[PDB]
Amino acid sequence: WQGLMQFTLPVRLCKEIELFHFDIGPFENMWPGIFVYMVHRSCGTSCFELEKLCRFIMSVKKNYRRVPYHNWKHAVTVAHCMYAILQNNHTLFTDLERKGLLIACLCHDLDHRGFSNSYLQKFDHPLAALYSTSTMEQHHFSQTVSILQLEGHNIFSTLSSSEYEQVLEIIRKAIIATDLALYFGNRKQLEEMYQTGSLNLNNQSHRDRVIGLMMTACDLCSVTKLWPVTKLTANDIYAEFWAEGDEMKKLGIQPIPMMDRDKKDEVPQGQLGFYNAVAIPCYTTLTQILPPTEPLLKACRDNLSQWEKVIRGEETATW
Ligand SMILES: Cc1cc(C)n2c(Br)c(CSc3nc4ccccc4[nH]3)nc2n1
Ligand SMILES: [Mg+2]
Ligand SMILES: [Zn+2]
Numbered sequence: 001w002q003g004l005m006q007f008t009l010p011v012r013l014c015k016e017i018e019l020f021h022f023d024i025g026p027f028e029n030m031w032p033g034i035f036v037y038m039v040h041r042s043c044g045t046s047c048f049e050l051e052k053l054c055r056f057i058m059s060v061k062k063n064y065r066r067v068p069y070h071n072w073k074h075a076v077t078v079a080h081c082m083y084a085i086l087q088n089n090h091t092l093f094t095d096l097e098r099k100g101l102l103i104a105c106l107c108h109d110l111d112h113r114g115f116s117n118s119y120l121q122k123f124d125h126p127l128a129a130l131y132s133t134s135t136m137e138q139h140h141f142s143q144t145v146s147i148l149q150l151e152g153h154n155i156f157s158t159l160s161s162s163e164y165e166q167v168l169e170i171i172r173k174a175i176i177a178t179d180l181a182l183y184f185g186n187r188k189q190l191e192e193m194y195q196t197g198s199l200n201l202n203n204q205s206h207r208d209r210v211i212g213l214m215m216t217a218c219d220l221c222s223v224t225k226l227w228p229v230t231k232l233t234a235n236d237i238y239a240e241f242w243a244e245g246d247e248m249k250k251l252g253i254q255p256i257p258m259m260d261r262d263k264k265d266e267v268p269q270g271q272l273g274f275y276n277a278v279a280i281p282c283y284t285t286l287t288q289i290l291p292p293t294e295p296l297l298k299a300c301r302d303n304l305s306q307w308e309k310v311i312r313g314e315e316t317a318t319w
Helices: 011-016 025-042 050-062 072-088 093-109 117-122 126-128 135-148 161-177 181-193 206-221 227-250 262-289 290-312
Strands: none
Touching: 011 025, 025 050, 025 072, 025 093, 050 093, 050 135, 072 093, 072 290, 093 135, 093 161, 093 206, 117 126, 117 135, 117 227, 126 135, 126 262, 135 161, 161 181, 161 206, 181 206, 181 262, 206 262, 227 262, 227 290, 262 290
16 A cells, blocks of 8 residues: 555656557556556545545455456456546546546456356355345445444545445446446437437436446446457456356256356357347447547447458457
8 A cells, every 4th residue: 555655657657658559468567556547537635535435446456356367457447447438538428427437347246256147146145135136236335334344444534424325326227337237228228319319418317328328338348448458358267257157066956058168169259249139239239429539439349350251261360
């Protein structure tokens, strides 16, 4: 925490970090510092007490598990995408939203066990008893509130009780929105609002939907990196999915192909299906609403053409 307070971002990165395609991968020692940097530039140096923010960040890190994908790296990656959207669309948002959203993104997968909502609900895990829908996401929000209530961690203590209640609702809605089950309906409504010219960012119901799609766009942003980085991250995603598949075999339940390591051949077509059904529509709608986010769409389209290249047998060396 102390070290973090003395972190300065190297000047070469100060330019690169503002770009959507920025990959945090090669800077692991600087991830906590990169988050403080992004909060300071977007929100401001006075949004949070520096000691409480650093204490908060280090507890958030401790409370992500050593799972192949839903880990600390993912949290900082999703926060960086949100940083880039906010910097590109700064004055469409309030200080409270900028605060809420950077924090929501860092916390949105807190205490992830590497198990899907399907697993927990099929195996009637206690979390699924509590949280009937959006099971892990309700848990991630609960974990965020637990961390905020730690001694020295309440980064929102400069707020009124009203504003505290407001920022918790921004965060609740933002984390819940990362349930991909909710994405399909959210994007369909946004697409209709946009095509019919009814979308109004000063309409709070519209604004909540736009924020939800920003949360999907940031959660999925590995598909917006340069091909080699996207391809490396896909390996982590499958490491985790296949471990769930293995855990189901043990328990006498057979898994869906995506979670079955003995169906690895179906990955390229699986990705094609994921890009067509989820990622391309997501970034397509976000770019309509927030034209500065276009680079995410262009990058997503580039990676789709790369998966097509893999499918027709034309890819290059792996390492
Ligand atoms: C960044 C990201 C996020 C999500 C949610 N991803 C998913 Br889901 C996938 C995998 S799509 C897929 N379908 C398959 C069918 C059979 C075998 C393998 C398959 N992979 N990638 C994601 N990336
Ligand atoms: Mg999640
Ligand atoms: Zn996530």
